[PDB]
């Protein structure tokens, strides 16, 4: 009974996270991030996932503190900050499994926060095939 199925655990709750997100639809969505699969040669999943976090890093970092995804409604201030919470979250997650210290950004072309949301969810279950097949 001891063990081998090295299914990281962290992936998981990261696919479902990715989910929820999806389900919210804030206007945050029409900013433009930048892209990090449009560049992508000699950089293994390590660097893929470093660039991702970079970008989120940057994103409810930046915004959060501009007044364009706040609004001034009420529900709208919470339905905010319940969002940056996700973000922040996976954001940790991601730069977990990764464990890179030197992780420098290059150049990319340009990508919606929803179709960059979209390609990475499926890049995920693309590289989840493991133990899990």
Not at 75 to 95: A, E, P, S, V
């Amino acid at each position: 009974e001891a063990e081998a199925h090295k299914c990281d655990i962290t992936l998981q709750e990261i696919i479902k996270t990715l989910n929820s997100l999806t389900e919210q639809k804030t206007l945050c969505t029409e900013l433009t991030v930048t892209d990090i699969f449009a560049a992508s040669k000699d950089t293994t999943e390590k660097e893929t996932f470093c660039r991702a976090a970079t970008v989120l890093r940057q994103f409810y970092s930046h915004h959060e503190k501009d007044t364009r995804c706040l609004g001034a409604t009420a529900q709208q201030f919470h339905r905010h900050k319940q969002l940056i919470r996700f973000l922040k979250r996976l954001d940790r997650n991601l730069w977990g499994l990764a464990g890179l210290n030197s992780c420098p950004v290059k150049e990319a072309d340009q990508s919606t926060l929803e179709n960059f949301l979209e390609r990475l969810k499926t890049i995920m279950r693309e590289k989840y095939s493991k133990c899990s097949s």
